[PDB]
Design an enzyme around this catalytic site. Structure first.
Site, PDB file in Angstrom:
ATOM      1  N   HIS A  96      -9.493   3.824  12.912  1.00 39.61           N
ATOM      2  CA  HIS A  96      -8.674   3.363  11.950  1.00 39.61           C
ATOM      3  C   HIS A  96      -8.731   2.714  10.876  1.00 39.61           C
ATOM      4  O   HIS A  96      -9.362   1.561  11.113  1.00 39.61           O
ATOM      5  CB  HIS A  96      -7.544   3.196  13.176  1.00 39.61           C
ATOM      6  CG  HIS A  96      -6.004   3.103  11.691  1.00 39.61           C
ATOM      7  ND1 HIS A  96      -6.055   3.142  10.760  1.00 39.61           N
ATOM      8  CD2 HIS A  96      -5.048   4.195  11.909  1.00 39.61           C
ATOM      9  CE1 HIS A  96      -4.457   3.067   9.999  1.00 39.61           C
ATOM     10  NE2 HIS A  96      -4.369   3.994  10.948  1.00 39.61           N
ATOM     11  N   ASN A 154      -4.266   7.931   5.790  1.00 36.10           N
ATOM     12  CA  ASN A 154      -3.961   6.623   6.604  1.00 36.10           C
ATOM     13  C   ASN A 154      -2.290   6.617   5.155  1.00 36.10           C
ATOM     14  O   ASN A 154      -1.711   6.342   5.077  1.00 36.10           O
ATOM     15  CB  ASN A 154      -3.899   5.775   7.395  1.00 36.10           C
ATOM     16  CG  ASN A 154      -4.760   5.497   6.772  1.00 36.10           C
ATOM     17  OD1 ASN A 154      -6.724   5.655   7.127  1.00 36.10           O
ATOM     18  ND2 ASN A 154      -5.449   4.382   6.448  1.00 36.10           N
ATOM     19  N   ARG A 162       1.292  -0.755  -0.261  1.00 39.52           N
ATOM     20  CA  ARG A 162       0.287  -0.192   0.190  1.00 39.52           C
ATOM     21  C   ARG A 162       0.824   1.491  -0.246  1.00 39.52           C
ATOM     22  O   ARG A 162       0.734   2.642  -0.704  1.00 39.52           O
ATOM     23  CB  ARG A 162      -1.073   0.087   1.310  1.00 39.52           C
ATOM     24  CG  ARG A 162      -2.103  -1.192   1.617  1.00 39.52           C
ATOM     25  CD  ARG A 162      -2.837  -1.355  -0.254  1.00 39.52           C
ATOM     26  NE  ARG A 162      -4.344  -0.248  -0.140  1.00 39.52           N
ATOM     27  CZ  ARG A 162      -4.276   0.494  -1.501  1.00 39.52           C
ATOM     28  NH1 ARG A 162      -3.869  -0.514  -2.498  1.00 39.52           N
ATOM     29  NH2 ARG A 162      -4.640   1.209  -1.775  1.00 39.52           N
ATOM     30  N   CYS A 180       1.304   7.083  10.240  1.00 44.41           N
ATOM     31  CA  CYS A 180       0.190   7.807   9.863  1.00 44.41           C
ATOM     32  C   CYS A 180      -0.166   8.519  11.164  1.00 44.41           C
ATOM     33  O   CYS A 180      -0.473   9.827  10.967  1.00 44.41           O
ATOM     34  CB  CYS A 180      -0.867   7.047   9.194  1.00 44.41           C
ATOM     35  SG  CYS A 180      -1.444   6.142   9.926  1.00 44.41           S
TER      36      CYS A 180
HETATM   37  N1  LIG Z   1      -1.069   0.998   5.501  1.00 46.42           N
HETATM   38  C1  LIG Z   1      -0.778   1.926   5.876  1.00 46.42           C
HETATM   39  O1  LIG Z   1      -2.522   3.079   6.274  1.00 46.42           O
HETATM   40  C2  LIG Z   1       0.283   2.794   6.958  1.00 46.42           C
HETATM   41  C3  LIG Z   1       1.038   4.742   7.292  1.00 46.42           C
HETATM   42  C4  LIG Z   1       1.043   4.591   7.691  1.00 46.42           C
HETATM   43  C5  LIG Z   1       3.067   3.558   7.986  1.00 46.42           C
HETATM   44  N2  LIG Z   1       2.150   2.194   7.203  1.00 46.42           N
HETATM   45  C6  LIG Z   1       3.695   1.367   7.130  1.00 46.42           C
HETATM   46  O2  LIG Z   1       4.369   1.261   6.140  1.00 46.42           O
HETATM   47  C7  LIG Z   1       4.819   0.343   6.051  1.00 46.42           C
HETATM   48  C8  LIG Z   1       3.871  -0.808   4.992  1.00 46.42           C
HETATM   49  O3  LIG Z   1       2.541  -0.783   5.488  1.00 46.42           O
HETATM   50  P1  LIG Z   1       1.556  -1.751   4.544  1.00 46.42           P
HETATM   51  O4  LIG Z   1       0.647  -1.831   4.964  1.00 46.42           O
HETATM   52  O5  LIG Z   1       1.096  -0.444   4.115  1.00 46.42           O
HETATM   53  O6  LIG Z   1       2.496  -2.697   2.581  1.00 46.42           O
HETATM   54  P2  LIG Z   1       2.020  -4.181   2.445  1.00 46.42           P
HETATM   55  O7  LIG Z   1       1.527  -4.976   4.143  1.00 46.42           O
HETATM   56  O8  LIG Z   1       0.853  -3.843   1.448  1.00 46.42           O
HETATM   57  O9  LIG Z   1       2.912  -4.721   1.882  1.00 46.42           O
HETATM   58  C9  LIG Z   1       3.780  -4.392   2.537  1.00 46.42           C
HETATM   59  C10 LIG Z   1       5.750  -4.777   1.451  1.00 46.42           C
HETATM   60  O10 LIG Z   1       6.530  -5.715   1.689  1.00 46.42           O
HETATM   61  C11 LIG Z   1       6.468  -6.904   0.452  1.00 46.42           C
HETATM   62  N3  LIG Z   1       8.081  -7.041   0.663  1.00 46.42           N
HETATM   63  C12 LIG Z   1       8.869  -6.145  -0.740  1.00 46.42           C
HETATM   64  N4  LIG Z   1       9.997  -7.175   0.330  1.00 46.42           N
HETATM   65  C13 LIG Z   1       9.571  -7.619   1.330  1.00 46.42           C
HETATM   66  C14 LIG Z   1      10.879  -8.629   2.145  1.00 46.42           C
HETATM   67  N5  LIG Z   1      12.409  -9.019   2.017  1.00 46.42           N
HETATM   68  N6  LIG Z   1       9.915  -8.962   3.278  1.00 46.42           N
HETATM   69  C15 LIG Z   1       9.009  -8.939   3.522  1.00 46.42           C
HETATM   70  N7  LIG Z   1       7.998  -8.760   2.295  1.00 46.42           N
HETATM   71  C16 LIG Z   1       8.934  -7.967   1.351  1.00 46.42           C
HETATM   72  C17 LIG Z   1       5.525  -7.869   0.470  1.00 46.42           C
HETATM   73  O11 LIG Z   1       5.072  -7.919  -0.581  1.00 46.42           O
HETATM   74  C18 LIG Z   1       4.854  -6.083   1.089  1.00 46.42           C
HETATM   75  O12 LIG Z   1       3.608  -6.339  -0.359  1.00 46.42           O
HETATM   76  C19 LIG Z   1       4.233  -1.190   7.753  1.00 46.42           C
HETATM   77  O13 LIG Z   1       4.912  -0.663   8.296  1.00 46.42           O
HETATM   78  C20 LIG Z   1       3.333   0.362   7.561  1.00 46.42           C
HETATM   79  O14 LIG Z   1       3.348   0.033   9.508  1.00 46.42           O
HETATM   80  C21 LIG Z   1       1.448   1.859   7.168  1.00 46.42           C
END
Ligand SMILES: NC(=O)c1ccc[n+]([C@@H]2O[C@H](COP(=O)([O-])OP(=O)(O)OC[C@H]3O[C@@H](n4cnc5c(N)ncnc54)[C@H](O)[C@@H]3O)[C@@H](O)[C@H]2O)c1
Ligand SMILES: NC(=O)c1ccc[n+]([C@@H]2O[C@H](COP(=O)([O-])OP(=O)(O)OC[C@H]3O[C@@H](n4cnc5c(N)ncnc54)[C@H](O)[C@@H]3O)[C@@H](O)[C@H]2O)c1
Ligand SMILES: NC(=O)c1ccc[n+]([C@@H]2O[C@H](COP(=O)([O-])OP(=O)(O)OC[C@H]3O[C@@H](n4cnc5c(N)ncnc54)[C@H](O)[C@@H]3O)[C@@H](O)[C@H]2O)c1
Ligand SMILES: NC(=O)c1ccc[n+]([C@@H]2O[C@H](COP(=O)([O-])OP(=O)(O)OC[C@H]3O[C@@H](n4cnc5c(N)ncnc54)[C@H](O)[C@@H]3O)[C@@H](O)[C@H]2O)c1
Lengths: 333, 333, 333, 333
Positions: D177, D314, D11, D150
């Site tokens: 959230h 977010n 995302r 976020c």
């Molecule tokens: N989603 C939100 O609303 C939001 C907002 C702010 C911060 N974050 C943070 O940003 C980060 C991303 O979260 P997310 O839920 O949006 O992403 P997500 O879960 O949708 O995807 C994270 C990606 O990491 C990939 N990836 C690449 N290299 C990898 C490796 N060695 N090992 C494992 N996976 C690997 C995975 O395929 C996966 O697509 C998190 O730490 C999250 O807490 C998320």
């Protein structure tokens, strides 16, 4: 009372346990899940978002899961070969992990002392059975069997009755199906099935299924005469089958209603249900039938071309048929 | 461009307004809604949970709704006979309230000096037209007209291509349909339609639709050969048609794909779409097509019996078609 | 065994009826709802998307709704003065239509021979009572009473325990609250509460609420020391209170847990619950408590500034409190 | 433009890419995600359930992902030490996997030739920056930095304004959230965060969060003066903070409104927003602000005790701030 171990304490694994307790037809004596320890199992089994709090007691005590005063052995093995079902007394094993659907993988439980294994999914090579449709073709040489899918358990009893009375020339099936565990909360990676990765609650999601062709396996006369597909939609449980078929003998829609209702009251009671009420999907949450024909929802174009609707609780209906199939297998030993 | 009044500033009325502004084929000059005052019309038109905030300016200025600098007359009349469409300069009137769908009721708009009425719904007695199917059957003597239903506008372009190329002997349709305003947030009273009163986002809800029957009205050769029903599922918008039909001429699925995609690139461009992508429903939100064939989602049982899947944005696609029909009617004056 | 008429067979009117039968504390003898005829009430009472099929018999017999073999008189009046509560033997009326909440309007039920009215919502002028907080201030001169709101019945018992033990200097509350019948399935008109008109299943919707202020009326020592606000979120039922308060006396969290737990097993038993489990909202569906303190979800900044969390089934918890209040008023005649 | 490599095309990863292309502030030249190959990346970038289709071209050509004609190198490595960022030209790396949030782990990208790392999440030991609040404290000796969460990006701009004008003595914060990828579609296993395992679209789910405490890292004067918790609710995107705080200097709600509005028009332009409209969460989908004050939703108890309400996308607001920080870091070289 046949003693049963469960491999995979997920949606199906825990609801099989609830149905085993509720019906008394089988007895759960062992559970194996490497990603749910004994304290976590107490929580996962006691609380359920879909089917409600468990009506009973569940505690951890001396390393066993004790449900209604009855202790259950808990294993934590990733490799099914290393589970000691024999010393736990488990004669039959429910293979409800989702990842051991072949005879060679499911056979792994026989190394552990299980006598037979019941895969809670369709198999590429294990014989499949549907309660009320072809279960009497089970015999004692089959040590590994599949209870088919939840969709096939809805479609085959209905298909049985329609074809016996009227003859199905050909049929196409759509199942509008509740969300399941393989889906994603938000758009994310889903390997070979790109649609299934899209946000579960956001979308109507087309999906491929062999469940209708599988009816041709439990009803050999219908081989090559049915297929279909699925739409996943944002509900947590309960699914609906829509079978468009072309009938050999002309049948008024009231005639279809009479033979289906008649069958629901006779040989298929508890499996095939009948209603004429203005039901919606939540009206079948925790309903133990495989298939409940919805008289008002279907519609005929004419006496040889009809659309038939039947509901099913894909979680609890299918779990009750796992229990029933093990009860019947025990009875043929 | 012809000047239009809009009766009923709901989902269709406000999205028809957006579609006019975006396309520039017709010009909104007047709106009537006795349940939404001028300042509230600024809010409901500016913000949209499904299609997002309007890209442009919208304000209340000296009694008019001013959108991108252009003022729109606002009326507050419960009875259509009292709307002064002439004064406001409205030549055509989109009747999208849902409660004036017959000739007698929709004709009340001509007393206020409107020249023609376009009912955004199926009508019992007004002529029904569908862009790309029978709109050239319109003639200048018809002052009250129906643009049929969103579902009819999805199914009829696809049926047209299939019937033209292989012949539809008979067909049964299911539409998995997003939620609409006539549904309820929680179980509540629903007059003559009990299933519709059940909690919208909790249920799959079977429902009637004459959309498949009405294709026989825009394609007379298929009269009597198509019917079907609907499932309301919990999504905000975008719906899908599932058509199971028998063909006269043997058709391989690759031939169906080719004639459909050929239609989409030619005489039905902008109306019937074609895709081979792993789409889900959200990928069609704010899509202006009437119908988009999903090549990977459908399935053939044999050369004469197939299930065809087609997506439609029931809000915005239909609204664009209302605009298109009014521009076409205008060009015939 | 006080005899009870229900005005408004909605969410609250039907769960008050269910809670009456299931508890045995009052007897439903009359129901009035001009939008639900007798056959429709059989259907709406029997099937519930949120709480499941009613466990018992319900049928229409000789113009009476017969529930568990007991017949109930059905009226269809829109004007309360035309309901003949007296002739049906209804002594108390549950005013649960949402549109007769003041004393002048709810007093219309006394014209028909009812002796007391219990308004199932806050009232501008009728005295408010919360079970377990201030219900003993009720006396026999009061023939129109209000049972406050669901949120007030959740907030007031907790606020009483916290204040009696540590003193609440000031407090602000948010309730995250499920969908209710006043909301819309899609963006539509909502009189003067514009945010309430937006698609319920798509949005977090801020909303005003006088529930926290109303605690000052049932706990007079807290007058003018509590207010708050709401968020409507896409769940069919179960809400949560989030209370942020300053304490007079320093209180470590474990002491707050201790006195709340003690209250839940003593005089507030069945009204205020307590849990340390890893609960979520569905674990409270069909729970009859007013308020369940969630130990693990709260958080303190320091011994005088804390965030307290309590769950409530806004439908079924509240409906039991209605039944409990009427049994208490009956016992005091 | 600094050249940027993205680790984790999820995302955040994908929406950082969108933001980078839409704003032109940095250039994406490399992507690593071992669970999404090239052709699947084309699909996942092209179609987005929450934010709509990419407005632009995306295709795979010569083993590169080509977005608007520019080629991006694709790695498929599980260990960040093996990613050849330097060879691909990536000078900064967005660490957006969620599994390398410490300095020792995120520093793994430095062995591949990247010059700096921006962790897309809170970090136990990396310095945190929030644009508009403390980003000037960045300097060029810092090669591994955190853009916080976020929620911290929503709370800190508001807290800064309130604290600089009135003084925050202490505060407690609740964020309502939206669902994220770490949650489950149905009740499944969730390690030691048992509540996070329960059906996401079925439940209000309370969850811990360090965000309010983290505000004390980016605003040191408020170290130890803020904490709070979270509620995950069934929406696909957009969240809201609910800050309850005591103020040192008296402040009428109009004064709070006035200073927030002037901050939103001056130094915090594009980061802190201000609105008085009747907004709901969908009105902030694809909104790029960190925090939008909702003037009408909040409520004061008195002039030193107030509840403040601010929305944030977010997904896209956070993603835009990752781009903004990297641009600011690049300007400092
Ligand atoms: N989603 C939100 O609303 C939001 C907002 C702010 C911060 N974050 C943070 O940003 C980060 C991303 O979260 P997310 O839920 O949006 O992403 P997500 O879960 O949708 O995807 C994270 C990606 O990491 C990939 N990836 C690449 N290299 C990898 C490796 N060695 N090992 C494992 N996976 C690997 C995975 O395929 C996966 O697509 C998190 O730490 C999250 O807490 C998320
Ligand atoms: N509607 C339904 O949910 C439904 C209906 C019919 C059939 N089925 C099928 O039953 C099977 C189980 O489905 P489910 O819905 O309960 O999925 P689930 O994800 O809810 O449960 C799967 C369980 O397998 C456990 N497990 C135990 N041993 C494991 C091991 N070595 N490796 C990996 N996991 C292990 C996992 O911890 C997990 O809890 C699947 O084949 C499914 O297709 C599901
Ligand atoms: N929503 C769809 O997907 C869709 C698609 C095709 C056709 N339609 C049809 O279009 C029509 C409107 O549907 P909708 O979804 O926009 O419903 P809606 O509830 O969103 O809009 C109805 C509007 O009419 C207003 N109204 C009510 N009474 C009125 C009166 N006397 N005079 C003027 N205005 C009045 C209402 O305030 C409301 O704004 C219906 O007939 C519908 O079946 C809907
Ligand atoms: N739903 C909740 O969680 C909840 C909780 C506490 C209090 N309340 C309050 O209880 C009251 C009812 O709430 P609800 O959720 O059941 O709403 P509802 O819409 O589900 O039920 C209201 C009923 O009143 C009927 N009705 C309308 N006009 C009527 C009239 N003149 N005479 C008789 N019946 C009429 C309607 O047909 C409807 O069935 C409201 O005031 C509500 O604020 C609701």
């Amino acid at each position: 009372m046949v003693k049963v171990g469960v491999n995979g304490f997920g949606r199906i694994g825990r609801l099989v346990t609830r149905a085993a307790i509720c019906s008394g037809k089988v007895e759960i004596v062992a559970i194996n899940d490497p990603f749910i320890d004994l304290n976590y199992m107490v929580y996962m089994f006691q609380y359920d978002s879909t089917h409600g709090k468990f009506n009973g007691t569940v505690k951890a005590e001396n390393g066993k899961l004790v449900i209604n005063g009855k202790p259950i052995t808990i294993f934590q093995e990733r490799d099914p070969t290393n589970i000691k079902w024999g010393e736990a007394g488990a004669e039959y094993v429910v293979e409800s992990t989702g990842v051991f659907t072949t005879m060679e993988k499911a056979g792994a439980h026989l190394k552990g002392g299980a006598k037979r294994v019941i895969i809670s999914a369709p198999s590429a090579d294990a014989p499949m059975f549907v309660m009320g449709v072809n279960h009497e073709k089970y015999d004692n040489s089959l040590k590994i069997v599949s209870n088919a899918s939840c969709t096939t358990n809805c479609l085959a009893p209905l298909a049985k009755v329609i074809h016996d009375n009227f003859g199905i020339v050909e049929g196409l099936m759509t199942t509008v199906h509740a969300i399941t565990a393989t889906q994603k909360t938000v758009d994310g990676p889903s390997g070979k099935l790109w649609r299934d990765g899209r946000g579960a609650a956001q979308n109507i999601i087309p999906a491929s299924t062999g469940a209708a062709k599988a009816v041709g396996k439990v009803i050999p006369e219908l081989n090559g005469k049915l297929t279909g597909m699925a739409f996943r939609v944002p509900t947590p449980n309960v699914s609906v089958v829509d079978l468009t078929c072309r009938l050999e003998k002309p049948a008024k829609y009231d005639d279809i209603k009479k033979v289906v209702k008649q069958a629901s009251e006779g040989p298929l009671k508890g499996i095939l249900g009948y209603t004429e009420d203005q039901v919606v999907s939540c009206d079948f949450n925790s309903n133990s039938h495989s298939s409940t024909f919805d008289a008002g929802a279907g519609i005929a174009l004419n006496d040889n071309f009809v659309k038939l609707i039947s509901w099913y609780d894909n979680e609890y209906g299918y779990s009750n048929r796992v229990v029933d199939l093990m009860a019947y297998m025990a009875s043929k030993e």
